[PDB]
RNA sequence: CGCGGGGUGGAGCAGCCUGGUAGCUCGUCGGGCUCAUAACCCGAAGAUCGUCGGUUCAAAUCCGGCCCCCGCAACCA
Protein backbone atom coordinates (compact mmCIF):
# COMPACT_ATOMS: atom_id res chain seq x y z
CA UNK A 1 0.00 0.00 0.00
CA UNK A 2 2.72 2.49 -0.97
CA UNK A 3 2.43 5.42 -3.37
CA UNK A 4 5.51 6.03 -5.56
CA UNK A 5 7.60 8.76 -7.18
CA UNK A 6 6.70 7.66 -10.71
CA UNK A 7 7.13 10.78 -12.88
CA UNK A 8 8.35 10.61 -16.51
CA UNK A 9 8.32 12.44 -19.86
CA UNK A 10 6.78 10.84 -22.93
CA UNK A 11 6.65 12.04 -26.50
CA UNK A 12 4.86 10.75 -29.62
CA UNK A 13 5.58 12.14 -33.11
CA UNK A 14 2.67 11.72 -35.58
CA UNK A 15 -0.50 13.89 -35.89
CA UNK A 16 -2.72 10.79 -36.07
CA UNK A 17 -0.79 9.88 -32.94
CA UNK A 18 -3.56 11.53 -30.95
CA UNK A 19 -5.93 8.82 -32.23
CA UNK A 20 -3.16 6.24 -32.82
CA UNK A 21 -3.00 6.04 -29.04
CA UNK A 22 -6.58 4.72 -29.15
CA UNK A 23 -5.68 2.39 -32.03
CA UNK A 24 -2.97 0.79 -29.94
CA UNK A 25 -5.42 1.00 -27.07
CA UNK A 26 -7.62 -1.34 -29.08
CA UNK A 27 -4.55 -3.41 -29.93
CA UNK A 28 -1.65 -3.20 -27.49
CA UNK A 29 -2.83 -2.29 -24.01
CA UNK A 30 -4.32 -5.30 -22.23
CA UNK A 31 -3.59 -7.71 -19.38
CA UNK A 32 -0.90 -5.46 -17.88
CA UNK A 33 -3.36 -4.80 -15.09
CA UNK A 34 -3.80 -8.49 -14.37
CA UNK A 35 -0.05 -9.10 -14.73
CA UNK A 36 -0.39 -8.97 -10.94
CA UNK A 37 -3.41 -9.41 -8.65
CA UNK A 38 -5.28 -7.16 -6.17
CA UNK A 39 -4.84 -3.62 -7.54
CA UNK A 40 -7.19 -0.66 -7.82
CA UNK A 41 -6.72 1.33 -11.03
CA UNK A 42 -4.15 2.58 -13.54
CA UNK A 43 -3.58 6.26 -14.28
CA UNK A 44 -1.52 8.81 -16.19
CA UNK A 45 -1.70 12.38 -14.96
CA UNK A 46 0.32 15.51 -15.70
CA UNK A 47 2.71 17.32 -13.37
CA UNK A 48 1.26 20.50 -14.75
CA UNK A 49 3.86 20.00 -17.38
CA UNK A 50 4.59 17.62 -20.34
CA UNK A 51 5.80 15.42 -17.49
CA UNK A 52 3.25 12.90 -16.22
CA UNK A 53 3.20 11.20 -12.84
CA UNK A 54 1.67 7.79 -13.46
CA UNK A 55 0.09 5.51 -10.88
CA UNK A 56 -0.40 1.83 -10.09
CA UNK A 57 -2.19 1.14 -6.79
CA UNK A 58 -2.38 -2.10 -4.79
CA UNK A 59 -1.96 -3.64 -1.35
CA UNK A 60 1.39 -5.26 -2.10
CA UNK A 61 3.89 -2.44 -1.50
CA UNK A 62 7.15 -3.36 -3.17
CA UNK A 63 5.70 -4.67 -6.41
CA UNK A 64 4.47 -1.11 -6.97
CA UNK A 65 7.89 -0.03 -8.22
CA UNK A 66 8.24 -3.28 -10.14
CA UNK A 67 4.91 -2.78 -11.85
CA UNK A 68 5.61 0.93 -12.10
CA UNK A 69 8.78 0.21 -13.97
CA UNK A 70 6.97 -2.23 -16.28
CA UNK A 71 4.47 0.42 -17.31
CA UNK A 72 7.33 2.72 -18.29
CA UNK A 73 8.83 -0.15 -20.25
CA UNK A 74 5.63 -0.28 -22.26
CA UNK A 75 6.25 3.03 -24.00
CA UNK A 76 9.91 2.02 -24.17
CA UNK A 77 9.03 -1.12 -26.11
CA UNK A 78 6.46 0.98 -27.95
CA UNK A 79 9.34 3.34 -28.65
CA UNK A 80 11.39 0.44 -30.01
CA UNK A 81 8.42 -0.09 -32.32
CA UNK A 82 6.13 2.93 -32.72
CA UNK A 83 8.78 5.69 -32.42
CA UNK A 84 7.71 6.72 -28.90
CA UNK A 85 10.27 8.45 -26.69
CA UNK A 86 9.46 8.04 -22.99
CA UNK A 87 12.66 9.93 -22.17
CA UNK A 88 12.61 12.55 -19.45
CA UNK A 89 15.93 14.41 -19.26
CA UNK B 90 -61.19 37.15 -46.16
CA UNK B 91 -57.49 36.46 -45.74
CA UNK B 92 -55.70 33.17 -45.44
CA UNK B 93 -52.77 33.17 -47.90
CA UNK B 94 -49.36 32.14 -46.54
CA UNK B 95 -46.24 33.52 -48.23
CA UNK B 96 -42.48 33.95 -47.69
CA UNK B 97 -41.84 33.64 -43.93
CA UNK B 98 -38.00 33.91 -44.00
CA UNK B 99 -35.36 36.23 -42.49
CA UNK B 100 -35.61 36.35 -38.67
CA UNK B 101 -34.71 39.46 -36.62
CA UNK B 102 -32.92 39.94 -33.27
CA UNK B 103 -32.10 42.71 -30.76
CA UNK B 104 -28.74 43.65 -29.12
CA UNK B 105 -26.95 46.73 -27.66
CA UNK B 106 -25.17 48.10 -24.59
CA UNK B 107 -25.78 45.90 -21.54
CA UNK B 108 -29.40 45.89 -20.30
CA UNK B 109 -30.69 48.12 -23.09
CA UNK B 110 -33.98 46.16 -23.14
CA UNK B 111 -33.12 43.17 -25.32
CA UNK B 112 -34.42 40.06 -23.54
CA UNK B 113 -37.72 41.75 -22.77
CA UNK B 114 -37.87 42.56 -26.47
CA UNK B 115 -37.36 39.03 -27.77
CA UNK B 116 -39.96 37.88 -25.26
CA UNK B 117 -42.08 41.02 -25.72
CA UNK B 118 -45.16 39.24 -27.04
CA UNK B 119 -45.43 35.54 -26.10
CA UNK B 120 -48.00 34.19 -23.62
CA UNK B 121 -50.80 35.64 -21.52
CA UNK B 122 -50.47 34.97 -17.79
CA UNK B 123 -50.97 31.32 -16.82
CA UNK B 124 -47.66 29.45 -17.20
CA UNK B 125 -45.43 30.58 -20.12
CA UNK B 126 -44.71 34.02 -18.64
CA UNK B 127 -42.28 36.76 -17.65
CA UNK B 128 -39.12 36.67 -19.80
CA UNK B 129 -36.02 34.71 -20.95
CA UNK B 130 -35.49 31.15 -19.69
CA UNK B 131 -34.08 29.22 -16.69
CA UNK B 132 -30.51 29.73 -17.94
CA UNK B 133 -29.07 33.19 -18.49
CA UNK B 134 -26.05 32.04 -20.45
CA UNK B 135 -25.99 32.64 -24.18
CA UNK B 136 -28.00 29.81 -25.78
CA UNK B 137 -31.33 28.92 -27.46
CA UNK B 138 -31.21 31.01 -30.65
CA UNK B 139 -34.82 30.98 -31.83
CA UNK B 140 -37.99 31.78 -29.90
CA UNK B 141 -39.49 29.68 -32.75
CA UNK B 142 -42.88 30.79 -34.08
CA UNK B 143 -44.14 34.22 -33.07
CA UNK B 144 -47.76 35.26 -33.39
CA UNK B 145 -48.01 38.61 -35.11
CA UNK B 146 -51.60 39.55 -35.84
CA UNK B 147 -54.11 42.34 -36.35
CA UNK B 148 -57.87 42.95 -36.63
CA UNK B 149 -60.25 44.48 -39.15
CA UNK B 150 -62.49 46.84 -37.17
CA UNK B 151 -59.73 48.30 -34.98
CA UNK B 152 -57.62 50.75 -36.96
CA UNK B 153 -54.13 50.11 -38.33
CA UNK B 154 -51.88 52.85 -36.84
CA UNK B 155 -52.23 51.87 -33.18
CA UNK B 156 -52.92 48.13 -33.60
CA UNK B 157 -50.73 45.00 -33.91
CA UNK B 158 -50.26 42.10 -31.40
CA UNK B 159 -49.66 38.41 -30.45
CA UNK B 160 -52.41 37.56 -28.00
CA UNK B 161 -55.55 36.49 -29.91
CA UNK B 162 -57.68 39.26 -31.46
CA UNK B 163 -58.25 42.44 -29.45
CA UNK B 164 -60.45 43.18 -26.43
CA UNK B 165 -59.79 46.89 -26.85
CA UNK B 166 -61.82 47.38 -30.04
CA UNK B 167 -64.28 44.57 -29.33
CA UNK B 168 -64.76 40.96 -30.45
CA UNK B 169 -66.79 40.03 -33.54
CA UNK B 170 -64.98 38.15 -36.33
CA UNK B 171 -61.70 36.19 -36.75
CA UNK B 172 -58.45 38.27 -36.82
CA UNK B 173 -55.81 38.30 -39.58
CA UNK B 174 -52.24 36.95 -39.25
CA UNK B 175 -49.04 38.59 -40.58
CA UNK B 176 -46.29 35.91 -40.87
CA UNK B 177 -44.30 33.08 -39.18
CA UNK B 178 -40.99 34.27 -37.68
CA UNK B 179 -38.57 33.59 -34.79
CA UNK B 180 -36.94 36.09 -32.45
CA UNK B 181 -33.20 35.75 -31.92
CA UNK B 182 -30.80 37.69 -29.70
CA UNK B 183 -27.23 37.81 -28.44
CA UNK B 184 -25.68 39.06 -25.18
CA UNK B 185 -22.83 41.53 -24.96
CA UNK B 186 -20.65 43.16 -22.34
CA UNK B 187 -16.96 44.03 -21.97
CA UNK B 188 -16.41 40.29 -22.24
CA UNK B 189 -19.37 39.24 -24.34
CA UNK B 190 -19.54 41.89 -27.09
CA UNK B 191 -18.14 39.50 -29.70
CA UNK B 192 -21.32 37.40 -29.43
CA UNK B 193 -23.08 40.23 -31.27
CA UNK B 194 -21.54 39.25 -34.60
CA UNK B 195 -22.21 35.55 -34.13
CA UNK B 196 -25.62 36.27 -32.61
CA UNK B 197 -26.41 37.92 -35.93
CA UNK B 198 -26.38 34.46 -37.55
CA UNK B 199 -30.15 33.81 -37.52
CA UNK B 200 -30.53 37.56 -37.11
CA UNK B 201 -30.96 39.41 -40.39
CA UNK B 202 -31.97 43.02 -40.18
CA UNK B 203 -31.97 43.19 -36.40
CA UNK B 204 -34.13 45.75 -34.64
CA UNK B 205 -31.99 48.11 -32.55
CA UNK B 206 -32.93 49.27 -29.07
CA UNK B 207 -30.97 52.29 -27.85
CA UNK B 208 -31.12 53.70 -24.32
CA UNK B 209 -33.12 56.48 -22.63
CA UNK B 210 -32.02 56.24 -19.00
CA UNK B 211 -28.34 55.70 -19.91
CA UNK B 212 -26.37 58.43 -21.83
CA UNK B 213 -25.03 57.95 -25.37
CA UNK B 214 -21.35 57.29 -24.90
CA UNK B 215 -20.82 53.86 -23.33
CA UNK B 216 -17.94 51.51 -24.07
CA UNK B 217 -20.01 48.93 -25.96
CA UNK B 218 -22.41 51.52 -27.42
CA UNK B 219 -19.97 53.25 -29.73
CA UNK B 220 -18.24 49.88 -29.78
CA UNK B 221 -21.60 48.68 -31.09
CA UNK B 222 -21.69 51.32 -33.81
CA UNK B 223 -18.12 51.16 -35.11
CA UNK B 224 -18.05 47.36 -34.91
CA UNK B 225 -21.55 46.17 -35.87
CA UNK B 226 -22.08 49.02 -38.35
CA UNK B 227 -20.06 47.16 -40.99
CA UNK B 228 -21.83 43.80 -40.46
CA UNK B 229 -24.33 44.65 -43.19
CA UNK B 230 -27.46 45.36 -41.16
CA UNK B 231 -28.84 48.76 -42.14
CA UNK B 232 -32.22 47.43 -41.05
CA UNK B 233 -31.41 48.41 -37.50
CA UNK B 234 -34.42 50.31 -36.23
CA UNK B 235 -33.55 52.44 -33.20
CA UNK B 236 -35.92 52.00 -30.30
CA UNK B 237 -35.41 54.05 -27.19
CA UNK B 238 -36.20 51.91 -24.19
CA UNK B 239 -35.65 52.21 -20.45
CA UNK B 240 -37.74 55.23 -19.57
CA UNK B 241 -40.40 55.06 -16.85
CA UNK B 242 -41.50 58.45 -15.49
CA UNK B 243 -39.75 61.82 -15.30
CA UNK B 244 -40.55 65.29 -16.40
CA UNK B 245 -41.78 63.97 -19.74
CA UNK B 246 -39.20 65.93 -21.76
CA UNK B 247 -37.22 62.63 -21.83
CA UNK B 248 -38.76 61.33 -25.10
CA UNK B 249 -37.73 64.06 -27.50
CA UNK B 250 -34.56 64.25 -25.39
CA UNK B 251 -33.47 60.75 -26.43
CA UNK B 252 -34.47 61.79 -29.95
CA UNK B 253 -32.03 64.76 -30.13
CA UNK B 254 -28.47 63.38 -30.02
CA UNK B 255 -29.52 60.50 -32.24
CA UNK B 256 -30.86 63.05 -34.70
CA UNK B 257 -27.32 64.43 -34.67
CA UNK B 258 -25.66 61.01 -34.92
CA UNK B 259 -26.74 59.07 -38.01
CA UNK B 260 -28.14 60.00 -41.43
CA UNK B 261 -25.23 62.37 -42.04
CA UNK B 262 -23.14 59.28 -42.60
CA UNK B 263 -23.38 55.62 -43.58
CA UNK B 264 -26.51 53.73 -42.51
CA UNK B 265 -29.49 55.56 -44.04
CA UNK B 266 -32.80 56.16 -42.30
CA UNK B 267 -33.24 54.28 -39.04
CA UNK B 268 -36.63 54.55 -37.27
CA UNK B 269 -36.43 55.60 -33.59
CA UNK B 270 -39.15 54.22 -31.33
CA UNK B 271 -40.19 55.38 -27.83
CA UNK B 272 -41.34 52.52 -25.51
CA UNK B 273 -41.33 51.06 -22.02
CA UNK B 274 -40.60 47.32 -22.01
CA UNK B 275 -40.27 47.64 -18.28
CA UNK B 276 -43.93 47.89 -17.52
CA UNK B 277 -45.44 46.39 -20.70
CA UNK B 278 -46.94 49.86 -21.01
CA UNK B 279 -46.48 51.20 -24.58
CA UNK B 280 -45.36 48.17 -26.69
CA UNK B 281 -47.74 48.81 -29.62
CA UNK B 282 -45.56 51.84 -30.25
CA UNK B 283 -42.59 49.49 -30.79
CA UNK B 284 -44.40 47.42 -33.43
CA UNK B 285 -45.91 50.45 -35.15
CA UNK B 286 -42.37 51.79 -35.45
CA UNK B 287 -40.66 48.54 -36.37
CA UNK B 288 -42.82 47.25 -39.23
CA UNK B 289 -40.41 48.69 -41.86
CA UNK B 290 -37.37 46.83 -43.22
CA UNK B 291 -34.16 47.56 -45.18
CA UNK B 292 -33.77 47.50 -49.00
CA UNK B 293 -30.87 45.26 -50.26
CA UNK B 294 -31.81 41.81 -51.69
CA UNK B 295 -29.68 38.81 -50.62
CA UNK B 296 -29.45 35.00 -51.08
CA UNK B 297 -29.81 31.89 -48.87
CA UNK B 298 -26.53 29.92 -48.71
CA UNK B 299 -23.65 28.22 -50.58
CA UNK B 300 -20.77 30.73 -50.45
CA UNK B 301 -17.25 31.00 -48.99
CA UNK B 302 -17.53 32.13 -45.31
CA UNK B 303 -15.50 31.56 -42.10
CA UNK B 304 -16.87 30.92 -38.58
CA UNK B 305 -15.04 31.89 -35.39
CA UNK B 306 -14.73 29.62 -32.34
CA UNK B 307 -15.91 30.53 -28.86
CA UNK B 308 -16.03 29.60 -25.19
CA UNK B 309 -15.90 26.14 -23.65
CA UNK B 310 -14.32 24.64 -20.54
CA UNK B 311 -11.15 22.54 -20.61
CA UNK B 312 -12.38 19.07 -19.59
CA UNK B 313 -11.03 17.23 -16.52
CA UNK B 314 -7.25 17.06 -16.55
CA UNK B 315 -5.64 13.59 -16.43
CA UNK B 316 -5.46 13.77 -12.61
CA UNK B 317 -8.21 11.20 -12.14
CA UNK B 318 -6.86 8.76 -14.70
CA UNK B 319 -5.57 8.87 -18.28
CA UNK B 320 -9.18 8.03 -19.04
CA UNK B 321 -12.01 10.47 -19.79
CA UNK B 322 -10.48 11.18 -23.20
CA UNK B 323 -13.01 11.67 -25.99
CA UNK B 324 -10.40 14.06 -27.33
CA UNK B 325 -11.61 17.09 -25.40
CA UNK B 326 -14.03 18.48 -27.96
CA UNK B 327 -14.24 22.31 -27.89
CA UNK B 328 -16.51 24.50 -30.02
CA UNK B 329 -17.47 27.84 -31.49
CA UNK B 330 -20.22 30.01 -32.96
CA UNK B 331 -21.10 30.96 -36.54
CA UNK B 332 -21.40 34.44 -38.00
CA UNK B 333 -22.00 34.27 -41.75
CA UNK B 334 -23.55 31.56 -43.94
CA UNK B 335 -22.88 27.82 -44.13
CA UNK B 336 -23.36 24.47 -45.88
CA UNK B 337 -23.40 21.18 -43.98
CA UNK B 338 -22.06 18.97 -41.17
CA UNK B 339 -18.43 19.57 -42.21
CA UNK B 340 -16.68 22.08 -39.93
CA UNK B 341 -12.96 21.74 -39.16
CA UNK B 342 -10.71 20.17 -41.79
CA UNK B 343 -7.96 22.61 -40.70
CA UNK B 344 -7.10 24.23 -37.39
CA UNK B 345 -5.71 27.53 -38.52
CA UNK B 346 -3.51 28.80 -36.70
CA UNK B 347 -1.55 26.50 -34.33
CA UNK B 348 1.26 26.01 -31.78
CA UNK B 349 4.51 28.07 -31.69
CA UNK B 350 6.90 25.14 -31.22
CA UNK B 351 9.67 27.69 -30.54
CA UNK B 352 12.55 27.26 -33.06
CA UNK B 353 15.41 29.73 -32.59
CA UNK B 354 14.89 33.47 -33.14
CA UNK B 355 11.81 33.69 -35.35
CA UNK B 356 8.97 31.48 -34.19
CA UNK B 357 6.13 30.44 -36.43
CA UNK B 358 2.75 29.29 -35.14
CA UNK B 359 2.06 25.95 -36.85
CA UNK B 360 -1.58 24.83 -37.50
CA UNK B 361 -2.94 21.31 -37.12
CA UNK B 362 -5.36 19.66 -39.56
CA UNK B 363 -8.21 17.18 -38.98
CA UNK B 364 -11.64 15.95 -40.14
CA UNK B 365 -14.71 16.34 -37.87
CA UNK B 366 -16.01 13.68 -35.47
CA UNK B 367 -18.25 15.55 -32.95
CA UNK B 368 -19.96 18.99 -33.01
CA UNK B 369 -21.91 19.48 -29.72
CA UNK B 370 -25.17 21.43 -30.04
CA UNK B 371 -25.96 21.32 -26.32
CA UNK B 372 -26.60 18.72 -23.61
CA UNK B 373 -26.78 16.55 -26.71
CA UNK B 374 -24.95 17.32 -29.98
CA UNK B 375 -25.77 18.27 -33.60
CA UNK B 376 -24.45 17.64 -37.10
CA UNK B 377 -23.65 21.30 -37.93
CA UNK B 378 -22.13 23.96 -35.67
CA UNK B 379 -24.74 26.04 -33.83
CA UNK B 380 -23.87 29.54 -32.50
CA UNK B 381 -24.58 30.92 -29.03
CA UNK B 382 -22.76 29.67 -25.93
CA UNK B 383 -20.80 26.53 -25.05
CA UNK B 384 -20.56 24.22 -28.03
CA UNK B 385 -18.09 21.41 -28.49
CA UNK B 386 -16.54 20.54 -31.85
CA UNK B 387 -14.41 17.43 -32.24
CA UNK B 388 -10.81 18.20 -31.40
CA UNK B 389 -8.54 15.40 -30.30
CA UNK B 390 -6.50 16.76 -27.41
CA UNK B 391 -4.65 15.42 -24.41
CA UNK B 392 -5.45 17.94 -21.68
CA UNK B 393 -2.40 20.03 -22.56
CA UNK B 394 -2.69 21.63 -26.00
CA UNK B 395 -6.21 22.99 -25.47
CA UNK B 396 -4.50 25.84 -23.60
CA UNK B 397 -7.33 26.82 -21.35
CA UNK B 398 -7.18 30.54 -21.92
CA UNK B 399 -3.38 30.53 -21.82
CA UNK B 400 -3.49 31.62 -25.38
CA UNK B 401 -6.50 33.94 -25.65
CA UNK B 402 -8.19 35.38 -28.74
CA UNK B 403 -9.40 32.26 -30.56
CA UNK B 404 -8.66 32.73 -34.27
CA UNK B 405 -10.06 30.88 -37.29
CA UNK B 406 -9.62 31.61 -40.99
CA UNK B 407 -9.58 29.54 -44.15
CA UNK B 408 -6.75 28.44 -46.49
CA UNK B 409 -3.48 30.45 -46.74
CA UNK B 410 -0.72 31.68 -49.07
CA UNK B 411 1.01 28.74 -47.44
CA UNK B 412 4.30 29.98 -45.92
CA UNK B 413 4.68 30.08 -42.08
CA UNK B 414 6.33 33.47 -42.27
CA UNK B 415 4.58 35.49 -44.92
CA UNK B 416 4.81 39.21 -44.51
CA UNK B 417 3.86 41.78 -47.06
CA UNK B 418 1.25 44.25 -45.84
CA UNK B 419 -0.37 47.01 -47.93
CA UNK B 420 -3.28 48.78 -46.21
CA UNK B 421 -5.51 51.58 -47.46
CA UNK B 422 -6.84 53.26 -44.35
CA UNK B 423 -9.75 55.46 -43.38
CA UNK B 424 -9.72 56.06 -39.63
CA UNK B 425 -12.07 58.74 -38.29
CA UNK B 426 -12.74 62.49 -38.41
CA UNK B 427 -10.94 62.85 -35.05
CA UNK B 428 -9.09 60.35 -32.82
CA UNK B 429 -10.94 58.37 -30.16
CA UNK B 430 -9.02 57.21 -27.09
CA UNK B 431 -10.13 57.04 -23.51
CA UNK B 432 -12.68 59.67 -22.40
CA UNK B 433 -10.32 62.41 -23.65
CA UNK B 434 -11.55 64.59 -26.54
CA UNK B 435 -8.16 66.09 -27.56
CA UNK B 436 -6.55 65.21 -30.88
CA UNK B 437 -3.63 62.78 -31.20
CA UNK B 438 -0.69 62.86 -33.62
CA UNK B 439 -1.05 62.11 -37.39
CA UNK B 440 1.35 60.02 -39.48
CA UNK B 441 5.05 60.24 -38.62
CA UNK B 442 8.04 58.12 -39.65
CA UNK B 443 8.42 54.51 -38.42
CA UNK B 444 5.63 54.70 -35.80
CA UNK B 445 4.35 51.47 -34.21
CA UNK B 446 0.67 50.55 -34.17
CA UNK B 447 -1.44 47.55 -33.32
CA UNK B 448 -2.33 45.71 -36.45
CA UNK B 449 -4.90 43.28 -35.21
CA UNK B 450 -6.50 40.88 -37.63
CA UNK B 451 -9.34 38.92 -36.02
CA UNK B 452 -8.91 37.56 -32.50
CA UNK B 453 -5.18 38.13 -32.56
CA UNK B 454 -3.65 41.50 -31.76
CA UNK B 455 -0.30 41.59 -33.52
CA UNK B 456 2.64 43.95 -33.19
CA UNK B 457 2.70 46.02 -36.27
CA UNK B 458 4.99 48.54 -37.70
CA UNK B 459 3.36 51.30 -39.58
CA UNK B 460 6.37 52.34 -41.60
CA UNK B 461 6.09 53.76 -45.11
CA UNK B 462 4.06 56.96 -45.41
CA UNK B 463 2.12 56.67 -48.65
CA UNK B 464 -0.09 59.56 -47.54
CA UNK B 465 -3.50 57.97 -46.75
CA UNK B 466 -2.21 54.41 -47.21
CA UNK B 467 0.42 52.58 -45.12
CA UNK B 468 2.59 49.45 -45.00
CA UNK B 469 2.37 47.56 -41.72
CA UNK B 470 4.60 44.60 -40.83
CA UNK B 471 3.57 41.85 -38.35
CA UNK B 472 5.40 39.33 -36.13
CA UNK B 473 3.19 36.40 -35.02
CA UNK B 474 2.02 34.39 -38.08
CA UNK B 475 -1.53 34.97 -39.41
CA UNK B 476 -3.57 34.49 -42.59
CA UNK B 477 -6.07 36.96 -44.04
CA UNK B 478 -8.50 35.62 -46.67
CA UNK B 479 -9.75 38.50 -48.86
CA UNK B 480 -9.23 42.23 -49.53
CA UNK B 481 -12.57 42.86 -47.86
CA UNK B 482 -11.75 43.14 -44.15
CA UNK B 483 -11.67 45.49 -41.17
CA UNK B 484 -8.28 45.96 -39.50
CA UNK B 485 -8.38 46.90 -35.83
CA UNK B 486 -5.67 49.46 -35.13
CA UNK B 487 -4.28 50.74 -31.83
CA UNK B 488 -1.67 53.06 -30.32
CA UNK B 489 1.22 52.55 -27.93
CA UNK B 490 1.74 54.58 -24.81
CA UNK B 491 3.65 53.00 -21.89
CA UNK B 492 2.38 49.40 -21.91
CA UNK B 493 -1.11 50.70 -22.54
CA UNK B 494 -3.26 50.67 -25.67
CA UNK B 495 -5.63 53.07 -27.47
CA UNK B 496 -7.64 52.28 -30.62
CA UNK B 497 -7.21 55.10 -33.14
CA UNK B 498 -9.22 54.03 -36.21
CA UNK B 499 -9.62 51.64 -39.14
CA UNK B 500 -8.10 50.51 -42.44
CA UNK B 501 -8.33 47.58 -44.88
CA UNK B 502 -5.64 45.39 -46.44
CA UNK B 503 -5.70 44.72 -50.13
CA UNK B 504 -4.48 41.39 -51.57
C1' C C 505 -14.51 12.81 -9.75
C1' G C 506 -17.06 20.11 -15.05
C1' C C 507 -15.02 25.83 -12.24
C1' G C 508 -11.48 28.90 -15.84
C1' G C 509 -6.38 34.12 -15.73
C1' G C 510 -3.84 34.75 -11.86
C1' G C 511 -0.43 36.85 -8.34
C1' U C 512 8.05 36.04 -11.18
C1' G C 513 9.36 45.73 -8.06
C1' G C 514 3.61 50.26 -7.27
C1' A C 515 0.33 48.74 -15.21
C1' G C 516 0.33 43.54 -19.10
C1' C C 517 3.70 38.92 -17.97
C1' A C 518 5.25 31.95 -22.60
C1' G C 519 7.54 32.07 -14.04
C1' C C 520 5.24 25.97 -12.50
C1' C C 521 10.32 19.61 -17.94
C1' U C 522 14.79 21.84 -18.05
C1' G C 523 16.14 21.32 -8.88
C1' G C 524 19.90 28.22 -6.50
C1' U C 525 21.87 35.45 -13.21
C1' A C 526 16.59 38.04 -12.66
C1' G C 527 12.91 42.86 -17.20
C1' C C 528 10.53 44.15 -23.14
C1' U C 529 6.70 48.07 -22.87
C1' C C 530 5.23 51.82 -15.90
C1' G C 531 5.71 55.61 -12.42
C1' U C 532 9.98 58.95 -9.58
C1' C C 533 14.26 62.76 -6.51
C1' G C 534 19.78 64.81 -8.16
C1' G C 535 22.30 67.15 -14.09
C1' G C 536 19.12 68.08 -17.69
C1' C C 537 19.39 71.37 -23.41
C1' U C 538 24.13 78.72 -25.48
C1' C C 539 15.15 77.23 -28.71
C1' A C 540 9.65 75.25 -26.53
C1' U C 541 9.83 68.45 -25.37
C1' A C 542 3.92 63.78 -23.50
C1' A C 543 10.61 61.87 -28.44
C1' C C 544 14.14 60.84 -24.89
C1' C C 545 19.76 61.65 -23.28
C1' C C 546 22.24 59.00 -17.24
C1' G C 547 17.83 52.61 -16.02
C1' A C 548 20.17 56.56 -9.21
C1' A C 549 16.11 54.27 -6.28
C1' G C 550 14.85 49.41 -3.34
C1' A C 551 15.46 43.27 -3.14
C1' U C 552 9.50 39.83 2.23
C1' C C 553 7.68 36.15 -4.67
C1' G C 554 0.83 36.82 -0.44
C1' U C 555 0.47 32.51 5.10
C1' C C 556 2.84 27.69 6.07
C1' G C 557 5.13 23.00 7.41
C1' G C 558 8.16 19.63 4.89
C1' U C 559 12.20 18.33 0.95
C1' U C 560 16.71 21.45 1.37
C1' C C 561 24.37 22.35 -0.01
C1' A C 562 19.90 27.39 -0.80
C1' A C 563 14.84 28.13 -1.96
C1' A C 564 12.35 32.85 -7.45
C1' U C 565 10.66 27.53 -9.18
C1' C C 566 7.23 21.28 -6.02
C1' C C 567 2.26 17.75 -2.79
C1' G C 568 -0.93 19.69 0.30
C1' G C 569 -3.86 23.04 3.94
C1' C C 570 -4.91 29.40 3.86
C1' C C 571 -6.04 32.22 0.18
C1' C C 572 -7.70 38.60 -1.58
C1' C C 573 -9.03 39.84 -6.80
C1' C C 574 -11.34 39.02 -12.38
C1' G C 575 -14.74 34.79 -13.37
C1' C C 576 -18.16 32.47 -19.29
C1' A C 577 -12.41 37.79 -21.59
C1' A C 578 -11.45 41.65 -28.29
C1' C C 579 -13.07 46.26 -33.25
C1' C C 580 -12.92 47.79 -24.24
C1' A C 581 -17.19 57.08 -22.02
Ligand SMILES: Nc1nc2c(ncn2[C@@H]2O[C@H](COP(=O)(O)OP(=O)(O)NP(=O)(O)O)[C@@H](O)[C@H]2O)c(=O)[nH]1
Pocket residue numbers: 104105106107108109110111112113114183184185210239240275
Ligand atom coordinates in the same frame (compact mmCIF):
# COMPACT_ATOMS: atom_id res chain seq x y z
N1 LIG D 1 -30.05 50.32 -15.47
C1 LIG D 1 -31.31 49.91 -15.67
N2 LIG D 1 -31.60 48.61 -15.61
C2 LIG D 1 -32.93 48.38 -15.83
C3 LIG D 1 -33.91 49.31 -16.10
N3 LIG D 1 -35.14 48.70 -16.28
C4 LIG D 1 -34.89 47.43 -16.11
N4 LIG D 1 -33.57 47.16 -15.84
C5 LIG D 1 -33.01 45.84 -15.59
O1 LIG D 1 -32.81 45.10 -16.78
C6 LIG D 1 -32.60 43.74 -16.31
C7 LIG D 1 -32.81 42.77 -17.45
O2 LIG D 1 -31.61 42.66 -18.19
P1 LIG D 1 -31.57 41.94 -19.59
O3 LIG D 1 -32.99 41.94 -20.04
O4 LIG D 1 -30.84 40.65 -19.39
O5 LIG D 1 -30.77 42.86 -20.49
P2 LIG D 1 -31.32 43.40 -21.79
O6 LIG D 1 -32.01 44.66 -21.44
O7 LIG D 1 -32.12 42.34 -22.42
N5 LIG D 1 -30.07 43.61 -22.74
P3 LIG D 1 -28.86 42.58 -22.68
O8 LIG D 1 -29.38 41.32 -22.01
O9 LIG D 1 -28.47 42.11 -24.06
O10 LIG D 1 -27.76 43.29 -21.93
C8 LIG D 1 -33.50 43.56 -15.10
O11 LIG D 1 -32.73 43.00 -14.04
C9 LIG D 1 -33.97 44.99 -14.79
O12 LIG D 1 -33.86 45.34 -13.43
C10 LIG D 1 -33.58 50.67 -16.17
O13 LIG D 1 -34.35 51.61 -16.41
N6 LIG D 1 -32.23 50.89 -15.94
Ligand code: MET
Pocket residue numbers: 213214219429430431432433581
Ligand atom coordinates in the same frame (compact mmCIF):
# COMPACT_ATOMS: atom_id res chain seq x y z
C1 MET E 1 -16.05 58.60 -25.63
O1 MET E 1 -14.98 59.10 -25.36
C2 MET E 1 -16.71 58.84 -26.98
N1 MET E 1 -16.45 60.18 -27.48
C3 MET E 1 -16.24 57.79 -27.99
C4 MET E 1 -17.18 57.57 -29.16
S1 MET E 1 -18.03 59.09 -29.66
C5 MET E 1 -19.64 58.84 -28.92
